Amino acid sequence: FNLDVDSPAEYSGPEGSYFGFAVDFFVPSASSRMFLLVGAPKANTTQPGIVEGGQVLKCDWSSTRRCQPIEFDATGNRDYAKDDPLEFKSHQWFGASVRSKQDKILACAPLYHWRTEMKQEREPVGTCFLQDGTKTVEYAPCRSQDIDADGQGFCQGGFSIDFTKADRVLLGGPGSFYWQGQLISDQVAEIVSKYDPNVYSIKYNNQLATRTAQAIFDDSYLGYSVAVGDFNGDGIDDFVSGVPRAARTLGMVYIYDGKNMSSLYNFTGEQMAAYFGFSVAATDINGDDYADVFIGAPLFMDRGSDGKLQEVGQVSVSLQRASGDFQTTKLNGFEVFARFGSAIAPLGDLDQDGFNDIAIAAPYGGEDKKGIVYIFNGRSTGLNAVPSQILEGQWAARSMPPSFGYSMKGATDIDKNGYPDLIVGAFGVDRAILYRARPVITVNAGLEVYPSILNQDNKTCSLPGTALKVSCFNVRFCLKADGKGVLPRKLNFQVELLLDKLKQKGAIRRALFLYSRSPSHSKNMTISRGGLMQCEELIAYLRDESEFRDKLTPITIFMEYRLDYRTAADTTGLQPILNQFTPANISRQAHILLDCGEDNVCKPKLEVSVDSDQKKIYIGDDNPLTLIVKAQNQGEGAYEAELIVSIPLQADFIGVVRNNEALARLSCAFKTENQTRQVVCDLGNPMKAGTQLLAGLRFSVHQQSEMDTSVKFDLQIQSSNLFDKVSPVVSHKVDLAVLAAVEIRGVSSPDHVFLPIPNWEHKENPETEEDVGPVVQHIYELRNNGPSSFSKAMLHLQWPYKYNNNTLLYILHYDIDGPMNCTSDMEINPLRIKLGCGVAQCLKIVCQVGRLDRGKSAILYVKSLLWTETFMNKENQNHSYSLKSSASFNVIEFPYKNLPIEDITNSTLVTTNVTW
């Protein structure tokens, strides 16, 4: 919110040269000055016979906005032999990627083609130039002897680059190995030392590189974008790279160990063709020293109202945890076709509040499509999902969308004021623009009024120059200001003070200042940045009783303060800014004495009672929890009386009871502050003597820790009265309950079988199912529907196996789905094929199941064959079969050991009729 959008520094490059495609800062340790680096991939150069060779320009600050090219390479194409060019630098897009670290500059030309040393080919291997102070050396890891497209020929090395803390270069070529992509990492020391202008295929010893893989991974574009951070705790930066076309074009992000290039983690997109992985960034966004991963999906389509898909873009934020797992949340764009998430630039600590920030670009948003950049601030709980600022492009399209925000870079304090700054590229119009961060000032205001309760008969002071005595009270207000970075020693503040500020329109105000006669007072205060609070005082008096009517409504004292930024601006004209999340005004109240009459002061007696209908609560459900609260004052009036509710770890507030008749309706409110959370409801200002009040509040509560057995509520009443400030404290308790309602059910397919079986005949020994008879399947499902889960249970299956010495149904093979393991007392398929148990011999099956949660279930599949020979025997005996099977279960242990367990058991019955 503190980025200066009023007077940014604007740089311009040659027309049509894509000036601003890549941007970066340059901070040479050998010099005090600092520069901007801007890449112009299509700029014409002085090289012999080279067209659109590309350029990198060094633009300075604190001077004329003049940009000058860096002479990385002054030569043309080398010759392999007489009239046989070795390389083709024309249209090489040099400067498409730029990075720097201290005095090192690395720029690459992804579209650099060369004629291999074995054929007359023309292959885009890509090349990079590294400038280390005075020495300049070419770096082309992909220009090796693995020439064909199945090797590194079409690597386009340098498509994306980055530096690590240990002075390693990370380079990505999305074309290696049939466009599988590749990552290559080399030590900057080895690159410089091993350089040789006469060797076109140099080999580096300590190189780390990924390797070719199966053909299924072709056209993945690994290395489309790269980032570096520590993701295994060894202090060595690991490699993060986006793979936008991986996994059927779902997109993926690979994290490779930074010391041996072994895989660590993978992220996968949710929508195809969204290009998940177009950009990536690694930075600590919540101040825990664990780097967090940001992934952009510019073309992501989400569903708005009515479900229509719209292309808004999305960014995935993943917070790293010490356990090695990532807590991920999604962040969507705001405009259609704006490609939100095109660029992600860590800003460092933009406002110096202790947490890093981040900027996300939508290079085609805003009015028309000039582009927009969003700034997001980091909290201790992660990224703040609301952008604190919006930067808007200011240049209209010439022949191409300006693309303001297509490339950004931050985290460098160019003006050394103590806050990092930001560069935004607009290569569409060939411009780059620098935004400076304004110093942030935090102001602590104070306001107090000692004689809060005013006795209009307490005539103490006298008006100046007149004999009238008036009841008057003191008003004391203070200011304290501080801030990090370069700020002036003294800050000028203008304070406006209002009495009876609740009066509006032409209504007469009941209070006036003593020395003056107006209800308003304004003062200019000079505050020195320091810890000691500075205060000032004034005397206000009540208007005579004859002039005003309202005795009940409180008198509101209102203070607002402003900072004149023009006076505090630094030498360059950069104005400070007040902190965004602190109010610019503060209020107090003074109450007339409402005839308490005891001793001209009011003695309240606040008392409460709380109750509920939910005598007990379950672990998780559609919580209807509610509380009915009684509040009463048995003493004299209470000023600014209010009810405070404090809640445990998990709880929520739904609102006051609206539908009930006798239930009183109140303007309750909810806030969380001082690492605590409460509900606040004004009981009446003031509550009259003997006042009786009854109200009810709706809550929502679900438990997941299993660490406790009951939930609680603690209540209090507070007022502004002199002595009886607080009511006696009360508490409410509700016990947890476990209700893991479970049901066991089954079905049989078919529901019936008719004999004689078509196309069947008796055989001495059967070998295939149709030799035995038709197939029968019995199915059972153990399901949990209750609010509560259970961790283990067991089920039984009772199945007839012999009646009148006849086999009946014949087991063939099991099948299940869920966390159980089963066993039976008799062999499965005893013969190698490729009317219940109360009267017939039985086969028994036993199985124990693991944790089934709410809505989860386990299914047992048993498929058998009807031994129709035995049923022909039955037909000869001429009886009928309502063949039957049964099952039962029992829960054995809940995960809520801290709570009393209750036995749950039931059984089900299934059948399969057989008739002629």
Binding site: F21, P41, W93, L111, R122, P124, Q156, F159, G175, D218, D219, Y221, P244, R245, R248, T249, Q271, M272, A273, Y275, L299, M301, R303, S305, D306, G307, L309, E311, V336, F337, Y364, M400, P401, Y406, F427, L502, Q504, K505, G506, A507, R549, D550, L552, T553, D652, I654, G655, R658, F670, N685, R745, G746, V747, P750, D751, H752, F754, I779, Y780, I859
Partner: protein
């Protein structure tokens, strides 16, 4: 009456309270009478009926031409949507319901544009379609009488990475290394404009030749965009069905892939096919994104058919789900079965009707109840499927307005997907009553002027208040006891205001405006859900969060859109539940899952089908007695005498009839989506 307790201030304020509020402009009204309440109660006070200001919202049909019965005729006569224009007038927060009919008119003209991949792999395919022009005409002759055919081809962007650029012979003959000749690479070339002389198709196709590119993915989408937007060049007829047959056998390049080639300019969606029939911006403009492709397909009313080989059918099946209105079919490696593919795809396209809304004002909301075949009514659903050519379906639409907007007239369009015909809705708002036409500012009718007299009580200006503006701001005499309190013992204005001359004036507000004769109503203190307050899909007045027409609930947290409840087979909640707030709630035992499709313990599948075969064989069954069995028998029925066991997934099932005989039948469904069952002729 709600109107009395909240309005009464003026005519405009009264009518905005609720649809049923009425205002009395008659000056003869008895003093102290309620001047704003529902008319039937108001008239008892003898307010002149002619002076009552009680506007009523209405929907009036302007253009209603009957649906056509046959597509063969004149362009201006064929009508597939009725009514064609409707005038809609609404009150500040009222709603009205109207209907629409849609017909898949038979014998409608068809346009087929054949967009073919011409990579070297498709050399065999190009030989198979050398007579597709005549064969396609013969097959389509039985469905339509006004067929038109066109042709076009694509390979990929003729640039580096994608193109061979060495040796220099490779530029003129990319197949140089294979000792064979093929055309130089091209992005997209238009060949044949949609014409009815189908013989031209064969002549043009016989002259084509394949090309060769380096990488596997192709540039098809970049060609789909140009085939869509270049309407005059391609030759689309506005009054005809538009089929775009897109054939390929490889992956496809997508947006942001062009950055490797040095192309960073986003696709602009314009037509860049020059006089030489070549897509000129191929080498300077990135591929189109799926969103832009969908937008341009919807605008031009073009149905896209993916005819792709089996090695990539899964990929384009998933792509098609992100481009609603598209079909996928499996193409043979030889392209020998493309004719049947096209014919089947055409049937699928015309078997479904789905509505679409254009330029709906932000203050409006719509809810649909579809009346599909057999009088089936599906609330909340705006599309039917399973139709045959010539069938008619109807929808019921209800429109509601989010309070009176500033603009007085606005319009929007309701249109079926792929249809030229549409319904144009003209919306009007009548928030201001007629009596306002004769306002008298600062007239002697108002105390000391200082106000405006309109429709009744004068609108007091600064410095005056009360009836007739007789009380000045400086009087505020406390002698009044003019009922200035909700109930004695409670403050005069509930502490939210101060009573002056008997009328409360509400004091400052946090982030809204306070209203009511006791300041008891506001538009910012509504209920909250998980800390969101009112959901924002509705009003927030007097603490009530009141939702739009397509949103519901005391918290407005409940949707009404049914897309999330749509099963993969295309019917609601698998037929086992209802959608509720975008989440199917199953109504039969054992059914669970997002769409009640996971039921493992449901009875044997043939059990459900036995009740249908009862309908389709014999005069028995409760559903047949209801005559509703045709609704439930969606599956094809064929009679046999010996069960066709020659099937991998056919379910052989039987049951005992009420008669002594036994019934035999089978069932299965295939990838095409057709569900069929065979029934034995005579019971055993």
């Amino acid at each position: 009456n709600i109107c009395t307790t909240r309005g009464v201030s003026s005519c405009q304020q009264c009518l905005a309270v609720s649809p049923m509020c009425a205002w009395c402009s008659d000056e003869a009204l008895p003093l102290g009478s309620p001047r704003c309440d529902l008319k039937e109660n108001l008239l008892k006070d003898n307010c002149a009926p002619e002076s009552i200001e009680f506007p009523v919202s209405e929907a009036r049909v302007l253009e209603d031409r009957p649906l056509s019965d046959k597509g063969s005729g004149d362009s201006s006569q064929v009508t597939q949507v009725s009514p064609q224009r409707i005038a809609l007038r609404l009150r500040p927060d009222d709603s009205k319901n109207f209907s629409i009919q849609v017909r898949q008119v038979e014998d409608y003209p068809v346009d087929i544009y054949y967009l073919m991949d011409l990579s070297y792999s498709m050399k065999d395919d190009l030989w198979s379609i050398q007579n597709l022009g005549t064969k396609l005409a013969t097959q389509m002759r039985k469905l339509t009488s006004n067929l038109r055919i066109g042709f076009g081809a694509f390979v990929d962007k003729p640039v580096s990475p994608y193109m061979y650029i060495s040796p220099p012979e490779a530029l003129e003959n990319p197949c140089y290394d294979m000792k064979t000749t093929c055309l130089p690479m091209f992005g997209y070339k238009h060949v044949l404009t949609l014409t009815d002389q189908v013989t031209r198709f064969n002549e043009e196709v016989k002259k084509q030749s394949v090309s060769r590119n380096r990488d596997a993915p192709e540039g098809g989408f970049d060609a789909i965009m140009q085939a869509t937007v270049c309407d005059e060049k391609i030759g689309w007829r506005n009054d005809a069905s538009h089929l775009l047959v897109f054939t390929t056998d490889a992956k496809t390049h997508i947006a942001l892939d062009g950055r490797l080639a040095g192309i960073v300019q986003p696709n602009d969606g314009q037509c860049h096919v020059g006089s030489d029939n070549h897509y000129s911006a191929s080498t300077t403009m990135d591929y189109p994104s799926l969103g832009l492709m969908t937008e341009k397909l919807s605008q031009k009313n073009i149905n896209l058919i993916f005819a792709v080989t089996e090695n990539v059918v899964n990929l384009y099946q998933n792509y098609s789900e992100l481009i609603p209105g598209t079909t996928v079919g499996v193409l043979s490696m030889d392209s020998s079965n493309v004719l049947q593919l096209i014919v089947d795809a055409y049937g699928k396209i015309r078997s479904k009707v789905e509505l679409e809304v254009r330029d709906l004002p932000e203050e409006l909301s719509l809810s649909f109840n579809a009346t599909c075949l057999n009088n089936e009514v599906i609330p909340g659903l705006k599309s039917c499927m399973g139709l045959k050519i010539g069938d008619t379906v109807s929808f019921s639409i209800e429109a509601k307005v989010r309070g009176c907007p500033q603009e007085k007239e606005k319009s929007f369009t309701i249109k079926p997907v792929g249809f030229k015909d549409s319904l144009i809705v003209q919306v009007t708002f009548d928030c201001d009553c007629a009596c306002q036409a004769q306002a008298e500012p600062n007239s002697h009718r108002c105390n000391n002027g200082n106000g405006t007299f309109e429709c009744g009580v004068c609108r007091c200006g600064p410095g005056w208040l009360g009836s007739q503006c007789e009380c000045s701001e400086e009087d505020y005499r406390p002698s009044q006891q003019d009922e200035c309190s909700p109930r004695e013992g409670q403050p005069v204005c509930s502490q939210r205001g101060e009573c002056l001359c008997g009328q409360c004036v509400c004091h400052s507000s946090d982030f809204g405006k306070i209203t009511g004769k006791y300041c008891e109503c506001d538009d910012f203190s509504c209920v909250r859900y998980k800390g969101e307050m009112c959901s924002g899909h509705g009003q927030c007045s007097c603490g009530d969060c009141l939702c739009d027409s397509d949103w519901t609930g005391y918290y407005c947290n409940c949707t009404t859109r049914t897309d999330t409840c749509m099963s993969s087979n295309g019917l609601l909640c698998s037929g086992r539940g209802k959608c509720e707030c975008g989440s199917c709630v199953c109504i039969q035992p054992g059914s669970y899952g997002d769409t009640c499709e996971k039921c493992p313990t449901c009875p044997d599948a043939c059990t459900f089908k036995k009740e249908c075969v009862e309908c389709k064989k014999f005069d028995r069954g409760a559903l047949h007695d209801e005559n509703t069995c045709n609704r439930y028998c969606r599956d094809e029925i064929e009679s046999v005498k010996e069960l066709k066991d020659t099937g991998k997934d056919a379910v052989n099932c039987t049951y005992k009839n009420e008669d002594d005989c036994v019934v035999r039948f089978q069932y299965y469904e295939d990838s095409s989506g057709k569900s069929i069952l065979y029934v034995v002729e005579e019971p055993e």
